[PDB]
């Protein structure tokens, strides 16, 4: 079984395109995040959301924050809305796609 430098398990199918890190000619290098999908309307792209807490200092309380990014969605792991995904960083793929989906966790619920 092939690894790419993440110590995780590959997908159970084979792809076509060359913009896939598992089966093609793409290289991943950088940050490694984790979120849940909020749309996949256009072709081969998703939108992933993650949440964190900001700590104000004058009032000493917390505050909820978000971050929405866009990721390439190779045809061997095509992710729908409402499921956890691991995403990695690589070169610019379009005007606003700079990440790629590598593994899907918890499909349905």
Partner 1 sequence: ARKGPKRHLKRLAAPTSWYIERKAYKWAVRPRPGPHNMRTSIPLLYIVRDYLGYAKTAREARKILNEGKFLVDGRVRKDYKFPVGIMDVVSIPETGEHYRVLPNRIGKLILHPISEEEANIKPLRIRNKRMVKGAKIQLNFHDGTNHLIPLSEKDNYFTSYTVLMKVPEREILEVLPFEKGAYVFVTQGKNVARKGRIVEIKKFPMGWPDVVTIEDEEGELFDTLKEYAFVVGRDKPRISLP
Partner 2 sequence: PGKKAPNGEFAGRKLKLKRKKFRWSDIRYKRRVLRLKEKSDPLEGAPQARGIVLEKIAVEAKQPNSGMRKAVRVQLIKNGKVVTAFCPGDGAIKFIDEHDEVIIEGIGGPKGGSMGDIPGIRYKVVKVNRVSLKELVKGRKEKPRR
Partner RNA sequence: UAGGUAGUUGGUGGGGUAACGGCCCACCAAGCCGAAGAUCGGUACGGGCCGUGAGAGCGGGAGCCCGGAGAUGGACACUGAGACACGGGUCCAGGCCCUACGGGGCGCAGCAGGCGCGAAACCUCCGCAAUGCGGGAAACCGCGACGGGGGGACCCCCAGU
Q: Can you give the binding site for RNA, defined by CB under 7 A?
A: 17, 19, 39, 41-45, 47, 57-58, 64-66, 68, 70, 72, 91-97
- Among residues 27, 61, 68, 91, the one that binds partner 2 under rule CB under 8 A: 61
Q: CA nearest 90: which of 28, 22, 9, 6?
A: 28
Give the separation between CA 1 and CA 74, rounded to whole angstroms: 19
**In the chain, which ranges are E strands?**
32-39, 45-55, 62-72, 84-89, 99-105
CB of 7 to RNA, least distance (A): 27
CB of 38 within 8 A of CB of 80? no
| Number of residues in contact with Zn ion under rule CB under 5 A | 6
Using the contact rule CB under 8 A, the part of the chain among 11-19, 37-45, 55-63, 76-84 near partner 2 is 55-63
Q: Which does 63 bind (CB under 5 to 8 A by kind): Zn ion, partner 1, partner 2, none?
A: partner 2
Interatomic CA distance for residues 42 and 14, integer angstroms: 22
Q: Does 63 bind partner 2 (CB under 8 A)?
A: yes
Tell me which residues touch partner 1 (CB under 8 A).
5-7, 29-30, 32
């Amino acid at each position: 079984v092939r690894d790419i430098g993440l110590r995780i398990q590959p997908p159970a199918e084979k792809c076509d395109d060359p913009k896939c890190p598992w089966h093609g000619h793409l290289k991943i290098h950088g940050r490694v995040f984790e979120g849940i999908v909020v749309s996949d309307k256009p072709r081969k792209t998703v939108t992933v959301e993650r949440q964190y807490y900001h700590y104000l200092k004058k009032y000493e309380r917390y505050e909820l924050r978000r971050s929405r990014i866009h990721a390439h969605n190779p045809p061997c792991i095509n992710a729908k809305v409402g499921d956890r995904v691991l995403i990695a960083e690589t070169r610019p793929l379009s005007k606003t796609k700079h990440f790629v989906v590598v593994a899907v966790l918890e499909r349905a619920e």
